[PDB]
Design a protein around this ligand. Structure first.
Ligand code: TF5
Length: 217
């Protein structure tokens, strides 16, 4: 595998989004993963509607809108629904709304998704290299997370109990520290223009490889 990957370089990552006071990280993680696949398949980079997932991938999928959800079940909704609308057509409001999905605004489909084996950072590396960005959960509870600015994030108090959905868009090494390149959804003010480099091959640090998944068109 390549020693480093950055899907931003391949034009497969949309602008960082801002979830506000709505726990829609899972929806941003899911659409991020699918956006990459849509670029790979069609050559067009298009932001997909996190709001569509918040409003429409609801109780049947075990999701709770602004109070949390699962990336995998979001993928299944997109499969079941035979599409997801673009962000432009179905914009993000940081609140729970009625389902307003319309196929005339469909910007992507999903045929399947894959869940990677628990805690296997080597398998995650392979997927990020060979498949695309991968949806993951991380333990983002610790005060240091919110205050991250640079370098490679390592928090001794981190656990594998994940609480925040994010997107792995790459990996590498910076000054001798291996990292996962993670796109967050707290706007470009967070971290490095909305990204955080998180420790890689350090014992499934912060649970980053606990629950990875990626969709396919
Ligand atoms: O904005 C993200 C907050 O997410 C919440 C909120 C409430 C209950 C659960 C979760 C939650 C936990 C883990 C994870 F990987 C998720 F993607 C995820 F949504």
């Amino acid at each position: 595998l390549p020693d480093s990957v950055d899907w931003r370089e391949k034009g497969c990552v949309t602008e960082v989004k801002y979830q506000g006071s709505c726990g829609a990280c899972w929806a941003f993680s899911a659409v991020g993963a699918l956006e990459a696949q849509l670029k790979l398949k069609t050559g067009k980079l298009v932001s997909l509607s996190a709001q569509n997932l918040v409003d429409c991938s609801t109780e049947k999928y075990g999701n709770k809108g602004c109070n949390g959800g699962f990336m995998t079940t979001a993928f299944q909704y997109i499969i079941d629904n035979k599409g997801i609308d673009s962000d432009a057509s179905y914009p993000y409001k940081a609140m729970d709304q009625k389902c307003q999905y319309d196929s005339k605004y469909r910007a992507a489909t999903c045929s399947k998704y894959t869940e990677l084996p628990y805690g296997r950072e080597d398998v995650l590396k392979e997927a990020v290299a060979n498949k695309g960005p991968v949806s993951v959960g991380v333990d983002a509870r610790h005060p240091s997370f919110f205050l991250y600015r640079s370098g490679v994030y390592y928090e001794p108090s981190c656990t594998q109990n994940v609480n925040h959905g994010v997107l792995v868009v790459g990996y590498g090494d910076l000054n001798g520290k291996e990292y996962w390149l993670v796109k967050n959804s707290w706007g470009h003010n967070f971290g490095e223009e909305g990204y955080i480099r998180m420790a890689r091959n350090k014992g499934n640090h912060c649970g980053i490889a606990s629950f990875p998944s990626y969709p396919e068109i």
